[PDB]
């Protein structure tokens, strides 16, 4: 896996060049915003149980068919697997944030997930909606202005929103 710093090195190596001044100054801005990145990871991770549970409640409240007899979170074995999937999807979104790159989300989580749900018979549309609900919950908690040194974090939230969309798209 890579991060924001390891990707630029890899792309620079493929050309066989030293880093330019416009690449050092870009990566130096990455470090300065590092504090904002750590708070966002800390805040979201600190409310993991709730973001998963609340998103699941709303999902099954909107699509009762999922938990009806026969349908794909009926029985505790399938319900638990669903709660686990949601928890896992969230776990790898937080991994991506800290690194500032989706390589770990792509390689470990997303790639070969759509094909899994198809073989199982799991609505990928329903999964993506569960991801989207976790997104709104995660963003609001992360960018909650109470009890932190005030400052703009608009760019960082789009990046966070990027990873959540990316997972939804991957199984939609």
């Amino acid at each position: 896996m890579l991060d924001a710093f390891a990707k630029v090195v890899a792309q620079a190596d493929a050309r066989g060049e030293f880093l330019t001044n416009a690449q050092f100054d870009a990566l130096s801005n990455l470090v300065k915003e590092g504090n904002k990145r750590l708070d966002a990871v800390n805040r979201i991770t600190s409310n993991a149980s709730t973001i998963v549970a609340n998103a699941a409640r709303a999902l099954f409240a909107e699509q009762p068919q999922l938990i009806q007899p026969g349908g794909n979170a009926y029985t505790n074995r399938r319900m638990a697997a669903c709660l686990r999937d949601m928890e896992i999807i969230l776990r790898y979104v937080t991994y991506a944030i800290l690194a500032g790159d989706s390589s770990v989300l792509d390689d470990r989580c997303l790639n070969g997930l759509r094909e899994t749900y198809q073989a199982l018979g799991t609505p990928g549309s329903s999964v993506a909606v569960a991801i989207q609900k976790m997104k709104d919950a995660a963003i609001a908690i992360a960018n909650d202005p109470n009890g932190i040194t005030p400052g703009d974090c608009s760019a960082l939230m789009s990046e966070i929103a990027g990873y959540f969309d990316r997972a939804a798209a991957a199984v939609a």
């Binding site: 896996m1 991060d3 990566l27 470090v31 991770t45 993991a48 690194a99």
Partner: protein, 162 residues
């Protein structure tokens, strides 16, 4: 590729955990150290050509036979001397890579992996590259923790060659 951020992620992922405050502390120390790492990296990059020409000569000084002895593995031809400078350039370029990415990952992946396999096949003496990296260490002209950073990754190369 090995970095504090990838290690922190690898540490958690192996045990199926979300990241804890344990891992978050590590990455802060990384961002905190970047200041001195970025300084050492940009400084070597700027004075790169002078260091490569300087190091290459220090090799030919210490080992004069490398410029006289006949054979493709030696710097006794325009081809050989071009290959020498190129190789020295590679080492220095990897040292800056480690400072930017705040870990040994780049030098490990692009250089060290299969290093002893190349030197053995192509009859390249490890000590030639030690002497090259020794010159860079003494003459990079850095101070404070910037020098501590640069040298840490330089000596990591030297240890890999010994």
């Amino acid at each position: 590729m090995k970095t504090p951020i990838t290690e922190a992620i690898a540490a958690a992922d192996t045990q199926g955990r979300f990241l804890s405050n344990t891992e978050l502390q590590a990455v802060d120390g990384r961002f905190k150290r970047a200041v001195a790492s970025m300084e050492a990296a940009r400084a070597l990059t700027n004075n790169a050509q002078s260091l490569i020409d300087g190091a290459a000569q220090a090799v030919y000084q210490k080992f004069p036979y490398t410029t006289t002895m006949q054979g493709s593995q030696y710097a006794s031809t325009p081809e050989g001397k071009a290959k020498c400078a190129r190789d020295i350039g590679y080492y220095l370029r990897m040292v800056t890579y480690c400072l930017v990415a705040g870990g040994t990952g780049p030098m490990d992946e692009y250089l060290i992996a299969g290093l002893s396999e190349i030197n053995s096949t192509f009859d390249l003496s490890p000590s030639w590259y030690i002497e090259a990296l020794k010159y860079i260490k003494a003459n990079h002209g850095l101070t404070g923790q910037a020098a501590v950073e640069a040298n840490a990754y330089i000596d990591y190369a030297i240890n890999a060659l010994s």
